[PDB]
Every structure is written in C-alpha cells, then in structure tokens.
Amino acid sequence: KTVIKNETGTISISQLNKNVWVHTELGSAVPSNGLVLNTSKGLVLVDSSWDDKLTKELIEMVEKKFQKRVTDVIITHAHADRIGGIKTLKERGIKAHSTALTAELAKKNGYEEPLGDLQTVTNLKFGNMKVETFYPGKGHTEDNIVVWLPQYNILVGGCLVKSTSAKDLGNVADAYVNEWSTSIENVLKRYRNINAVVPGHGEVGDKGLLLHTLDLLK
Ligand SMILES: C[C@H](CS)C(=O)N1CCC[C@@H]1C(=O)O
Ligand SMILES: [Zn+2]
Ligand SMILES: [Zn+2]
C-alpha cells in the first residue's frame, strides 16, 4: 504494498508491514526516506524532513490516517533532510531523540537541538514496538546512526547506506571515506540476519545495499 500520497505527491507513505511504513518526501526534486512506526502508544518517526512545511504535512497526514499522535522522532544525523523539521517537532512537544554528537552538530549549524540522549547502543520501546539505535562509526557523516527493529529485522540505514540507483558516493563534503567501509562492516557484524534495509534516498532493498555501499567506497 500500500502506497498513499498527499494531494501534491511530494509526500508518500509506503507500507512495509502492519505497523511499519516508509515516508518519502521530495525537496526541491530530491527524495528522502524515513520510517513511520504505528505503536499502541502513538506514532514514532525515524527522521523528519527537509523543512518545517514538509514535516508539518507529514505529521498531519499520519496523525489523521492512524488516528493517534506523533510522540517521538529519532534523528539519524544533522543534515537538513533528517533534521530540517526540528523546530516543528519542538514546538509541538514531539520528543526529538539523537546522539549527543548529532545535537552538537545541529547547534553548530544553527538548528534547534534534539535531546542528545542516544548512546552508541540505545534500546527504546514504544508501546510494544522495540527500537534499537546504533552508532557504527563515521561514514556519510561523522554522526550517522542506524535504527534496527528487532521484531521485524528491518534496518534503517539512513544516508550511510546507498540505494541500488546510487552509482557514486554523492555528497562527501561531510564524509569520512576511509572509515565508511569499517562502519558498514560494523553494521553487517551486528545484524547478521536482515529482512529489509531502508536507505536514506532511493528504493528499499536488503543486505545487498550494504554490499553495494562497500563497492562504491572502493
Ligand atoms: C542533501 C542530502 C543530505 S544526506 C545529500 O547529501 N544527498 C541526497 C542525495 C544524494 C546526497 C547523498 O546522500 O549523498
Ligand atoms: Zn546526510
Ligand atoms: Zn540524506
């Protein structure tokens, strides 16, 4: 699968299973993905969107559809596609989780700050939905984290992980190209049985996206 769009087509949600959807927004056209987790205690997002306008629209779409409030967002690094809606989150009383380093970089770059509560490994539970966050090391950015749903073996790779359609490393201004492969290997070592991998940009895939990223780093 079910795919549902906003009137414009700039925001789309695609169902992976009964309680997990991918959200995708176009920023001006460049698509960006996160997750929507439908839990018994509210909606939890992995990542916001490019700006406040899109973040507001995303929240409004999912609250209406799932008939509950967005309570929490996990911010996976301090680039605009991930954190651009932080002002909206904070003013609505939506908890914005991040590592301390992500918060430090957000502040440095003039964004409002997320909580800085996530450690190298953090285990969260929202209703019955289990979420693990993992900092595997530097790669796409110094601060990038991945998000794991152990009840589904779904990995949110974020922008650390390239989609099949990506034929080069893309934006390496903030990247650590000599450490990115080790960081991917750390993800592969931690999660040895993966059902789906959601990249930050592009189509959902599987463990092959991690291997693709390794190949692009050669
Ligand atoms: C503006 C975003 C922030 S991750 C960006 O750097 N992009 C989006 C598509 C390609 C490029 C990248 O992730 O390498
Ligand atoms: Zn980025
Ligand atoms: Zn990105």
- Name the one residue in this structure whose structure tokens are 């920023």: 27
- Please give the method by which this entry was determined: X-ray
CA distance 55 to 87: 10
- 203, 165 contact by CB (below 8 A): yes
Number of domains the chain contains: 1
CA distance 138 to 99: 13
CATH number of residue 27's parent domain: 3.60.15.10
Going 157 to 160 to 162 to 166, the CA torsion angle's sign is positive
Structural domain containing residue 119: 1-218
Query: Which of 23, 77, 97, 212 is the catalytic position?
Result: 77
- 50, 81 contact by CB (below 8 A): yes
Q: Is 101 helix (H, G, I), strand (E, B) or coil?
A: helix
Question: Which amino acid is present at 121?
Answer: V
- CA of 129 from ligand 1 middle (Å) equals 29
- CA of 101 from ligand 2 middle (Å) equals 14
Resolution limit, Å: 1.2
Strand order in the sheet with 30-39: 3-5, 11-17, 20-27, 30-39, 42-46, 70-74, 95-97
Question: Is 162 annotated among the ligand-binding residues?
Answer: yes
> What is the DSSP code (8-state) at residue 205?
B
- 69, 105 contact by CB (below 8 A): no
Q: Is 80 exposed, middle or buried (0-12, 13-18, 19+ CB in 10 A)?
A: middle
Q: Which of 47, 81, 165 to mutate to test the pocket of ligand 1 (most atoms within 8 A of CB)?
A: 81
